[PDB]
């Protein structure tokens, strides 16, 4: 897993799938909007982006994964989406240190973390951080 360092979360995210674009199928994308992030959480939020994805390359078999990272004030929302195939997460969830890690990952900056995941609708991971205005 690649490190922040000095890097602002934003710049870490597109500095990644700079790199990963070159190598790998799938498109991907992301849409950061341009905000600070507290820089207590910000290595949380990028371990939890890198595995998102690599969980999305390697397992979804789709053809478009996108990172967004928005500001709503109170919070702020990180959502990973992919276009492929979809998994029941009941079924890994307990027995996955991938999904497990990103989850406590999230309780550690006090964020909810929820993952969508249906036949149709590819895999949506989202987490809500909260921001003190
Ligand atoms: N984006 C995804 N699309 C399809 N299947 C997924 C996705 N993310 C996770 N999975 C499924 O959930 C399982 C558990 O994920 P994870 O804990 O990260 O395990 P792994 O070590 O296999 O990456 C994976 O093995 C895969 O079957
Ligand atoms: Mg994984």
Redesign the pocket.
């Known amino acids: 897993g690649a490190m922040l360092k000095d890097k602002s979360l934003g710049e870490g995210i597109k500095d990644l799938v700079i790199d990963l674009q070159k190598k790998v199928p799938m498109k991907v994308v992301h849409e950061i909007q341009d905000f600070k992030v507290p820089k207590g959480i910000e290595d949380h939020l990028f371990r939890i982006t890198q595995?998102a994805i690599?969980?999305?390359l390697?397992?979804?078999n789709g053809t478009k994964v996108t990172v967004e990272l928005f500001n709503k004030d109170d919070y702020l929302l990180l959502r990973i989406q992919?276009n492929?195939?979809?998994?029941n997460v009941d079924e890994?969830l307990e027995q996955?240190?991938?999904?497990?890690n990103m989850r406590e990952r999230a309780l550690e900056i006090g964020a909810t973390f929820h993952i969508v995941?249906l036949p149709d609708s590819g895999?949506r991971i989202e987490v809500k951080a909260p921001l003190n205005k």
């Open positions: 595995e690599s969980n999305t390697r397992h979804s992919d492929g195939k979809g998994f890994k996955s240190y991938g999904l497990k995941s895999t």
